[PDB]
Symmetry: D2
Subunit: 123 residues, 4 copies
């Protein structure tokens, strides 16, 4: 999964996830969203299980993007939680949480939830 996870991935929206998996469990890279209040690349950091089970299970992982870069600041952050599944049609299947910074009176509606599936090939 070190070599399997490292590289360029694309989700069903056409967003681009560029990641390097380190031997120590680290995830580092950039994310470019095809939708939303976003332009160009944003820093991402995360972690993955660097010694997954040998029983055919996937490899658990997660990462975060704060939606601030040199071009825009959406005052929000998304975390993706999911698992990498290797093989001919490799995939990273995730669920995600997008929290906006809000006032206290708006906090009940601060967080979106969704799900993204990443594949090595762009749909």
């Amino acid at each position: 999964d070190e070599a399997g996870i490292t590289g360029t991935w694309y989700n069903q929206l056409g967003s681009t996830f560029i990641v390097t998996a380190g031997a120590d469990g680290a995830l580092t890279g950039t994310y470019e969203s095809a939708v939303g209040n976003a332009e160009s690349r944003y820093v991402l950091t995360g972690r993955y299980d660097s010694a997954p089970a040998t029983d055919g299970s996937g490899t658990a992982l997660g990462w975060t993007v704060a939606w601030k870069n040199n071009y825009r600041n959406a005052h929000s952050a998304t975390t993706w939680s999911g698992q990498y599944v290797g093989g001919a049609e490799a995939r990273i299947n995730t669920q995600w949480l997008l929290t906006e910074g809000t006032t206290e009176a708006n906090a009940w509606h601060s967080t979106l939830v969704g799900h993204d599936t990443f594949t090595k090939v762009k749909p």
Copy 2:
């Protein structure tokens, strides 16, 4: 500019300990120790926060990840917390979280727990 407000030791309602450093570049680095679950001692965390939040009283958006592997245990799972920091006398980090376990394909429909943790600067 919540670098100083976020950096430090935080505790959630379960008694877990979140130790974080906020970097000027938006980085979150540190350790997490869960009071519950398949866990022992500290685990590495990394994440990101909005280093230039709005100045209208809104909170500061942030998130981080722990993969539950350390030198003592490997639960083959990862949790991400997504939330916002609220400064002030009773500073808080209010989060929702997703915990995904590595599964076979047949078990993937039940791979992911959801919950919510509130962190404060004083422990329960």
Copy 3:
């Protein structure tokens, strides 16, 4: 088991009012009044609960739905609460919820909010 415990008026941390009847057959019926959002007055709710919960001290699983349309407003959205009832001197219903808004396909990635509400038998100030 908890028909009488669940039936009644409950309030969450936002000051919303959840009025429910638990039927012997597992049904939940009632009305919801949200203190926040694109809502006024009462909306119909329906749901289900475990009418024969475990006897080991576990809570009682339940859930319900509100579609945010009534005679006054239509927010073109629906919220589902999923949770458990915990009986005792300080009874509580602890939930997580999903609010989905009807969207076009291009907006569907941002259709769904998630949150958490705790309901008690006495309301906040």
Copy 4:
């Protein structure tokens, strides 16, 4: 508006069967049969939908609940699906769901699974 479009038999990606009647008043009634999990045969479901959806091409919001007790099994849990119906040649109901199991207080942090199901009018 979508009473006739929603009413009927639907199937998700797991092969589960969702049988629903949409009432003129916004009610949803029917049965659910899960292809996976601690489940056998049909369970009662009830829910609600927007009976006067927007006319700008948006989907129709809806949700429903199953408590996983029937004459055969009791899993002491309930699932709520929250989502929208999208009409047309390939009609679909896209949902996210929350499955809460009754737990003791010490296990409540891990009480709730989250997932997503897509329903179509023809089985995979």
